[PDB]
Design an enzyme around this catalytic site. Structure first.
Site, PDB file in Angstrom:
ATOM      1  N   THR A  13     -12.086  -8.789  -3.082  1.00 19.35           N
ATOM      2  CA  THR A  13     -13.335  -9.238  -3.073  1.00 19.35           C
ATOM      3  C   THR A  13     -13.744  -9.750  -4.598  1.00 19.35           C
ATOM      4  O   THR A  13     -14.082  -8.577  -5.485  1.00 19.35           O
ATOM      5  CB  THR A  13     -14.197  -8.466  -2.493  1.00 19.35           C
ATOM      6  OG1 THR A  13     -13.865  -8.262  -1.285  1.00 19.35           O
ATOM      7  CG2 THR A  13     -15.668  -9.109  -2.522  1.00 19.35           C
TER       8      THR A  13
ATOM      9  N   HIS B 294       0.919  -1.200   0.120  1.00 18.12           N
ATOM     10  CA  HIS B 294      -0.003  -0.047  -0.144  1.00 18.12           C
ATOM     11  C   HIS B 294       0.861   1.261  -0.012  1.00 18.12           C
ATOM     12  O   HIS B 294       0.661   2.269   0.767  1.00 18.12           O
ATOM     13  CB  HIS B 294      -0.856   0.006   1.073  1.00 18.12           C
ATOM     14  CG  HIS B 294      -1.779  -1.252   1.481  1.00 18.12           C
ATOM     15  ND1 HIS B 294      -1.741  -1.928   2.546  1.00 18.12           N
ATOM     16  CD2 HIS B 294      -2.490  -2.061   0.705  1.00 18.12           C
ATOM     17  CE1 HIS B 294      -2.342  -3.166   2.482  1.00 18.12           C
ATOM     18  NE2 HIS B 294      -2.824  -3.093   1.106  1.00 18.12           N
TER      19      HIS B 294
ATOM     20  N   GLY C 274      -9.927  -8.059  -7.737  1.00 18.08           N
ATOM     21  CA  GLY C 274     -11.315  -7.857  -8.412  1.00 18.08           C
ATOM     22  C   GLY C 274     -11.735  -6.530  -9.104  1.00 18.08           C
ATOM     23  O   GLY C 274     -10.769  -5.601  -8.949  1.00 18.08           O
ATOM     24  N   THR C 275     -12.823  -6.632  -9.626  1.00 20.44           N
ATOM     25  CA  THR C 275     -13.231  -5.202 -10.174  1.00 20.44           C
ATOM     26  C   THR C 275     -13.630  -4.046  -9.510  1.00 20.44           C
ATOM     27  O   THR C 275     -14.199  -4.271  -8.263  1.00 20.44           O
ATOM     28  CB  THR C 275     -14.482  -5.688 -10.962  1.00 20.44           C
ATOM     29  OG1 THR C 275     -15.385  -6.230 -10.130  1.00 20.44           O
ATOM     30  CG2 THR C 275     -14.298  -6.248 -12.267  1.00 20.44           C
TER      31      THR C 275
ATOM     32  N   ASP D 250      -5.703  -2.328 -13.087  1.00 19.05           N
ATOM     33  CA  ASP D 250      -7.188  -2.130 -12.132  1.00 19.05           C
ATOM     34  C   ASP D 250      -8.262  -2.300 -12.915  1.00 19.05           C
ATOM     35  O   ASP D 250      -8.341  -1.455 -13.796  1.00 19.05           O
ATOM     36  CB  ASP D 250      -7.014  -0.897 -11.452  1.00 19.05           C
ATOM     37  CG  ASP D 250      -6.130  -1.331 -10.042  1.00 19.05           C
ATOM     38  OD1 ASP D 250      -5.803  -0.244  -9.443  1.00 19.05           O
ATOM     39  OD2 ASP D 250      -6.073  -2.409  -9.743  1.00 19.05           O
TER      40      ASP D 250
HETATM   41  N1  LIG Z   1     -12.517  -6.709  -5.355  1.00 18.96           N
HETATM   42  C1  LIG Z   1     -11.530  -6.244  -4.441  1.00 18.96           C
HETATM   43  N2  LIG Z   1     -11.226  -6.442  -3.358  1.00 18.96           N
HETATM   44  C2  LIG Z   1     -10.192  -5.954  -2.576  1.00 18.96           C
HETATM   45  N3  LIG Z   1      -9.741  -4.605  -2.923  1.00 18.96           N
HETATM   46  C3  LIG Z   1     -10.266  -4.346  -4.121  1.00 18.96           C
HETATM   47  C4  LIG Z   1     -11.027  -4.767  -4.977  1.00 18.96           C
HETATM   48  N4  LIG Z   1     -11.378  -3.993  -6.137  1.00 18.96           N
HETATM   49  C5  LIG Z   1     -10.655  -3.135  -5.883  1.00 18.96           C
HETATM   50  N5  LIG Z   1      -9.906  -3.068  -4.731  1.00 18.96           N
HETATM   51  C6  LIG Z   1      -9.111  -1.965  -3.970  1.00 18.96           C
HETATM   52  O1  LIG Z   1      -9.031  -0.934  -5.076  1.00 18.96           O
HETATM   53  C7  LIG Z   1      -7.784  -0.077  -5.008  1.00 18.96           C
HETATM   54  C8  LIG Z   1      -7.770   0.895  -6.019  1.00 18.96           C
HETATM   55  O2  LIG Z   1      -7.490   2.059  -5.581  1.00 18.96           O
HETATM   56  P1  LIG Z   1      -6.061   3.043  -5.858  1.00 18.96           P
HETATM   57  O3  LIG Z   1      -5.132   2.295  -5.114  1.00 18.96           O
HETATM   58  O4  LIG Z   1      -6.453   4.485  -5.050  1.00 18.96           O
HETATM   59  O5  LIG Z   1      -6.054   2.925  -7.254  1.00 18.96           O
HETATM   60  P2  LIG Z   1      -4.867   3.455  -8.462  1.00 18.96           P
HETATM   61  O6  LIG Z   1      -5.163   4.867  -8.775  1.00 18.96           O
HETATM   62  O7  LIG Z   1      -4.641   2.381  -9.391  1.00 18.96           O
HETATM   63  O8  LIG Z   1      -3.228   3.749  -7.403  1.00 18.96           O
HETATM   64  P3  LIG Z   1      -2.686   4.329  -6.002  1.00 18.96           P
HETATM   65  O9  LIG Z   1      -1.986   3.280  -5.345  1.00 18.96           O
HETATM   66  O10 LIG Z   1      -3.530   4.761  -5.345  1.00 18.96           O
HETATM   67  O11 LIG Z   1      -1.544   5.315  -6.570  1.00 18.96           O
HETATM   68  C9  LIG Z   1      -6.827  -1.368  -4.798  1.00 18.96           C
HETATM   69  C10 LIG Z   1      -7.529  -2.462  -4.451  1.00 18.96           C
HETATM   70  O12 LIG Z   1      -7.152  -2.850  -3.034  1.00 18.96           O
HETATM   71 MG   LIG Z   2      -4.215  -2.594  -7.943  1.00 13.51          MG
HETATM   72 MG   LIG Z   3      -3.463   1.189  -5.918  1.00 13.52          MG
END
Ligand SMILES: Nc1ncnc2c1ncn2[C@@H]1O[C@H](COP(=O)(O)OP(=O)(O)OP(=O)(O)O)C[C@H]1O
Ligand SMILES: [Mg+2]
Ligand SMILES: [Mg+2]
Ligand SMILES: [Ca+2]
Ligand SMILES: [Ca+2]
Ligand SMILES: [Ca+2]
EC number: 4.6.1.1
Lengths: 146, 735
Positions: free
Chosen positions: B485, B288, B515-516, B430
């Site tokens: 999830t 993270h 996941g999505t 993502d």
């Molecule tokens: N199904 C899921 N289960 C668990 N976490 C999920 C799921 N879907 C999405 N997430 C969470 O969404 C998060 C994405 O947000 P974020 O990390 O702010 O994206 P980013 O803009 O690609 O990069 P940064 O790390 O924030 O610089 C990362 C992930 O742990």
């Molecule tokens: Mg990610």
């Molecule tokens: Mg991220």
């Protein structure tokens, strides 16, 4: 662990039906407090939760004893959600209503050949208020209502 | 789009049996062309002069080329075309006659032509040799120098070989000829006059009837949608801003198709794309830290947070580190740190990309070092030679925000385990969502369960049974050991994606780790641009949170594909306390629905937690209890409305028996709302409930009889002492 929000609701309802405003509720009352909250334990399944806490005039439960009972049935299920997603699915067009047209149109992709006759059928028995279509409200009913 | 418009059903079956006889002689296509061309034909009553609701000022008479000869005597016309955007054919008819001297209809026929000439083929794709060459047949193709019908005052010009040389100069003129060519081909009298005189124009129009018209009528149809579509950038135009690694996107191109399902990604960051193709692994759930957007480390997840996007933010670094450290502490063996190493290519890129500037060489402890430069004024960077490791330190006259001051040290980046070896971590792909087709989901349920369900006799049971199946095998999302999830079919979809880019030659592990984002209920993020990969295999990149929510209503939502949106939309997301809006159908119809017993109680509960005053206080005032007894009273009707035993009644009744049920509710509401002191917070809610009940009852009316209004129907009752005949009354109240 029932969330606080999830608590205020069981009191706003537990209390709303405690006619003789004390703090406990009759058996019949319990059934009503429930149904109103959207549920309807069998006229016999309704006593299992209550019979388990026999320290009253035998047939009465306070608030704190109800706040508990709402576990045996609720600490697992989280289906209300999914069912609302399914709905958004049949409601193909986006009218917040599920038309018999689409009931079929979706019933046929999941592999089921339905008769333009027996569809109007379901759609009918699902509608509670007559508009010939189904909304989430009556749709929730249809589904969960066992 | 109905092309014909009859303004007056005045005259008998003769204006009609006359307007018809006209149109049925024009090819069902010449119209389908005129229609798509946004044209509309106007068949009014007698409106000779500028009296037609469209014969005003807009784009009238300007220059005199006017009929089958010019004449510009407007007061003497019965057919007209409103030339400028959309074509408007306007025609009138007087008493019984067009069939004796047809020379009068030959106009309503050509008068038209100028509807499709200039947009026909004459100039419709562009002049295409088809017409252009067919025009050349001024006089030197066929032994027929006969065109004294369409070419005189402007084209008695045989003296100059007619081609690209001057055919443009007189576009309108080559129309006055196509229009007659058309008038003649369809005029209910002089057919052969054409075939007899001009031998080509005949076979021309003729091939138009043969299909030529079904042509354009399909070049406008197709350029109908692709014209008024949704601005999305497609092809390698988007795949650019997207971020994905090209060879990867394409790699994906295959699965979308095979498995028939839409894939949608959020923005992958640019500074990581190559790193990815390069071989750098991707950030999973276990880490993270924040990526970085500057200096060498750029695109990598620095172990030091003051070397990433949050350079300076004393707290996000002072909390960023906390996580990296833990990331290793907890998941040791899989999550660690390793010294940065910007390979050969990577450099020449942070070059023009504008991140670093390679230069002045230097020596230190007997090893070669190239002082990597940057404008950042907090650290100095430099890269080794043997191993191209990277190093930094604070400058000789500055300090860290955390307050540290150090000399040359290696830049450790974060890294996960991949086949026993730790590889540096960068941005991952993502997914914003996955839209499988409803049919693919059917292929998801085991043939015996879905079989054991449709045998159920109870039709109502068969619907439920099925839904739970669709839900079960395709909507339900549970947590998962590794991939966060997501749905099961979603997981299998996840692997197929990875194994896919694995054969594409990747070596850093997976590229889709969780996941999505439509399950990122806690900390939902709202991205504008969203790259997509349709089932056909094209590439699309919306530009707006709107567009997306739109490109999806149009292709994913209402098109047999299964999609579901973030449970936190149109609510405040706990985690980041964020509000992200998304058009929800269900809510789009709350406006006209009699709330539920439980939805009602729930609402009260809510307000109780806020004004800290309930609909009724726990006191001794016999005024309070009245209010109590009265909500319980609504909590009664309200559920009575939604009674499942409404099946034993007939539609007609349903609406009735309910329009009442609901009405009773409105009553007691009204009551309370006209009671003792009820906090003005409920005063309002209760007010809102009214508009609803009202609305819902009005809907239950427009399904049955039509003049009857709520406000009134209600007025006409008597809820004083007896509800007896009140209801019977209500029946008659509906006749
Ligand atoms: N199904 C899921 N289960 C668990 N976490 C999920 C799921 N879907 C999405 N997430 C969470 O969404 C998060 C994405 O947000 P974020 O990390 O702010 O994206 P980013 O803009 O690609 O990069 P940064 O790390 O924030 O610089 C990362 C992930 O742990
Ligand atoms: Mg990610
Ligand atoms: Mg991220
Ligand atoms: Ca009691
Ligand atoms: Ca619908
Ligand atoms: Ca309905």
């Amino acid at each position: 662990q029932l969330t606080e929000e999830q608590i205020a609701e069981f009191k706003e309802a537990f209390s709303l039906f405690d006619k003789d405003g004390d703090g406990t509720i009759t058996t019949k009352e319990l059934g009503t407090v429930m149904r109103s909250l959207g549920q309807n334990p069998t006229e016999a399944e309704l006593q299992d939760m209550i019979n388990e806490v026999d320290a009253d005039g035998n047939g009465t439960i306070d608030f704190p004893e109800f706040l508990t009972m709402m576990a045996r049935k609720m600490k697992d299920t989280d289906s209300e959600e999914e069912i609302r997603e399914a709905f958004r699915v049949f409601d193909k067009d986006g009218n917040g209503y599920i038309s018999a047209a689409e009931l079929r149109h979706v019933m046929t992709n999941l592999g089921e050949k339905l008769t333009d006759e027996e569809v109007d059928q379901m759609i009918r028995e699902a509608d509670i208020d007559g508009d010939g279509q189904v909304n989430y409200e009556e749709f929730v009913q249809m589904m969960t209502a066992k | 789009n109905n092309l014909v418009k009859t303004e007056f059903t005045n005259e008998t079956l003769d204006k009609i049996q006359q307007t018809q006889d006209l149109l049925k002689k024009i090819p069902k296509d010449v119209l389908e062309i005129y229609s798509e061309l946004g044209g509309e034909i106007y068949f009014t009553d007698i409106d000779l002069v500028e009296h037609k609701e469209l014969q005003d000022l807009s784009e009238e008479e300007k220059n005199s080329m006017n009929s089958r000869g010019e004449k510009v005597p407007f007061a003497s016309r019965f057919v007209f075309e409103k030339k400028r955007e959309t074509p408007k054919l306007i025609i009138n008819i007087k008493d019984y006659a067009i069939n004796s001297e047809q020379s009068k209809e030959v106009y309503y026929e050509i008068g038209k032509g100028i509807s499709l000439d200039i947009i026909s083929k004459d100039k419709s794709l562009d002049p295409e040799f088809l017409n252009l060459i067919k025009s050349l047949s001024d006089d030197s193709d066929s032994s027929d120098l006969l065109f004294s019908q369409k070419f005189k005052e402007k084209l008695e010009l045989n003296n100059k070989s007619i081609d690209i040389n001057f055919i443009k100069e007189n576009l309108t003129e080559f129309q006055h000829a196509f229009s007659l060519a058309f008038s003649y081909y369809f005029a209910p009298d002089h057919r052969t006059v054409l075939e007899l005189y001009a031998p080509d124009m005949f076979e021309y129009m003729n091939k138009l009837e043969k299909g030529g018209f079904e042509k354009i009528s399909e070049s406008l149809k197709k350029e109908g949608v692709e014209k008024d579509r949704i601005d999305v950038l497609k092809g390698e135009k988007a795949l650019k801003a997207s971020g994905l690694v090209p060879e990867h996107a394409d790699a994906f191109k295959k699965i979308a198709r095979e498995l028939n399902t839409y894939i949608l990604f959020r923005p992958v960051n640019k500074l990581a794309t190559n790193l990815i193709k390069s071989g750098v692994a991707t950030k999973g759930l276990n880490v993270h830290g924040k990526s970085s957007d500057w200096g060498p480390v750029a695109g990598y997840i620095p172990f030091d947070q003051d070397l990433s996007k949050k350079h300076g933010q004393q707290l996000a670094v002072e909390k960023g580190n906390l996580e990296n450290k833990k990331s290793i502490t907890e998941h040791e063996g899989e999550i660690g740190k390793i010294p940065l190493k910007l390979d050969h290519l990577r450099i020449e890129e942070l070059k023009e990309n504008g991140i670093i500037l390679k230069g002045k060489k230097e020596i230190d402890n007997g090893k070669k070092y190239y002082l990597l430069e940057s404008n950042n004024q907090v650290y100095e960077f430099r890269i080794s030679d043997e191993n191209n490791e990277v190093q930094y330190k604070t400058k000789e006259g500055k300090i860290t925000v955390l307050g540290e001051k150090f000399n040359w040290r290696n830049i450790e980046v974060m890294a996960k385990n991949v086949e026993g070896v730790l590889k540096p971590l960068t941005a991952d792909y993502d997914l914003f969502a996955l839209a499988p087709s409803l049919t693919e989901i059917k292929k998801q349920i085991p043939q015996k369960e879905w079989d054991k369900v449709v045998n159920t006799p109870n039709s109502l049971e068969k619907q439920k049974g099925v839904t739970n199946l669709l839900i079960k095998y395709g909507i339900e999302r549970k947590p998962d050991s590794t991939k966060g999830t997501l749905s099961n079919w979603q997981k299998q979809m996840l692997d197929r994606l990875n194994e896919a880019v694995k054969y594409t030659g990747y070596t850093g592990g997976d590229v889709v780790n969780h996941g999505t984002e439509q399950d990122n209920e806690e900390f939902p993020e709202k991205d504008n641009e969203i790259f997509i990969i349709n089932p056909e295999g094209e590439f699309i990149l919306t530009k707006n949170w709107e567009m997306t929510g739109r490109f999806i209503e149009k292709n994913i939502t209402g098109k047999d594909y299964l999609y579901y949106f973030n449970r936190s939309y149109n609510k405040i997301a706990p985690g980041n306390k964020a509000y992200i809006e998304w058009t929800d159908p269900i809510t789009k119809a709350k406006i006209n629905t009699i709330p539920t017993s439980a939805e009602f109680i729930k609402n009260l509960s809510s307000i109780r937690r806020s004004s800290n005053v309930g609909v009724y206080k726990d006191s001794g005032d016999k005024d309070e209890f009245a209010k109590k007894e009265s909500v319980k009273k609504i909590a009664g009707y309200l559920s009575d409305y939604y009674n499942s035993a409404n099946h034993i009644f007939s539609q007609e009744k349903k609406r009735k028996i309910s329009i009442f049920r609901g009405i009773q509710a409105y009553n007691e509401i009204e009551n309370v709302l006209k009671s003792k002191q009820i906090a003005p917070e409920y005063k309002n809610y209760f007010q809102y409930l009214k508009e609803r009940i009202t609305n819902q009852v009005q809907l239950l009316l427009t399904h049955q009889k039509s003049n009857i209004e709520f406000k009134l129907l209600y007025k006409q009752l008597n809820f004083t002492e007896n509800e007896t005949d009140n209801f019977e009354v209500f029946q008659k109240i509906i006749d």
